[PDB]
Subunit: 33 residues, 3 copies
Amino acid sequence: EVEALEKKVEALEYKVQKLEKKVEALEHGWDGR
Amino acid sequence: EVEALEKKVEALEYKVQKLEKKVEALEHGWDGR
Amino acid sequence: EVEALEKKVEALEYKVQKLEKKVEALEHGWDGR
């Protein structure tokens, strides 16, 4: 059960960092946004 | 403690998928964005 | 291992709530967006 959770949390951490980068770009209007 | 974490992680997975859909729409300019 | 996961999940919950607020603002066009 912990191993299952560890994998899911690591995948969430990747997806959340990606979302943070994308949203910062939208909010700052980077690169033509 | 694991059951508590499992529920929180499942709820996070739902919220992150929702955010990914919303952000893809903003980045792609879907549906009038 | 559970304590490590608990900290990571709490940090994810904070980051996801922040993202939800930011994305709602972008979608609703709040505050000049």
